[PDB]
Amino acid sequence: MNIFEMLRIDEGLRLKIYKDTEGYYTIGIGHLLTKSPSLNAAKSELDKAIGRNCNGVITKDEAEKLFNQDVDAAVRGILRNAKLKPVYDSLDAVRRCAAINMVFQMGETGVAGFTNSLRMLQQKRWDEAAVNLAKSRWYNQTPNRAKRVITTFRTGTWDAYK
């Protein structure tokens, strides 16, 4: 188990443009293309990302390459963020995967309201952090996935994915 397998489970793999849980055009392993309602805008973003004229369809190799870039971008964003980096560095490797998972799904902006949860995680108050993480739009809108990520923070194991 590693961050790539974890997010592959949570995001799936689709080779044609689809809509994510929020209704936004996406492709591959959860690669968000645009929040615009325009499919043409999504197709342009896809072509820019892949470097060829795709008309909404990619290969599995292309999906896996985008995914690697997206995971790396989430990590580097955490490491450049003065609020996220100290909490991330305080965590063990399994819990760091849960942190990347959240940033992948909601971005630095979406995690901005998790300040109290982050403090509890840095304090290693795992059950309290787990309860607090569930008091969120995130948990209410994607409960099965949030439950897996929260269990990973609570236990420091891969039990929710195994």
UniProtKB/Swiss-Prot annotation:
This is Endolysin. Its EC number is 3.2.1.17. Changing E11Q: Complete loss of activity. Substrate binds at L32, F104, S117, N132. Keywords: Antimicrobial, Bacteriolytic enzyme, Cytolysis, Glycosidase, Host cell lysis by virus, Host cytoplasm, Hydrolase, Viral release from host cell. Gene3D superfamilies: 1.10.530.40. Its main location: host cell. Changing S117F: 10-fold decrease in enzymatic activity. Optimum pH is 7.3. GO terms for cellular component: host cell cytoplasm. Changing E11N: Loss of 84% of enzymatic activity. The active site is at E11 (proton donor/acceptor), D20 (proton donor/acceptor). The lineage of its organism: Viruses, Duplodnaviria, Heunggongvirae, Uroviricota, Caudoviricetes. CDD domains: T4-like_lys. Belongs to the glycosyl hydrolase 24 family. Changing G30F: Almost complete loss of enzymatic activity. The enzyme is destabilized by 1.5 kcal/mol. GO terms for molecular function: lysozyme activity. Changing N132I: 5-fold decrease in enzymatic activity. The keyword Hydrolase applies. It catalyses: Hydrolysis of (1->4)-beta-linkages between N-acetylmuramic acid and N-acetyl-D-glucosamine residues in a peptidoglycan and between N-acetyl-D-glucosamine residues in chitodextrins. It is found in: Host cytoplasm. PANTHER family: T4-TYPE LYSOZYME 1-RELATED. HAMAP family: ENDOLYSIN_T4. GO terms for biological process: cell wall macromolecule catabolic process; defense response to bacterium; peptidoglycan catabolic process; viral release from host cell by cytolysis. Endolysin with lysozyme activity that degrades host peptidoglycans and participates with the holin and spanin proteins in the sequential events which lead to the programmed host cell lysis releasing the mature viral particles. Once the holin has permeabilized the host cell membrane, the endolysin can reach the periplasm and break down the peptidoglycan layer. Induction: Expressed late in the viral replication.
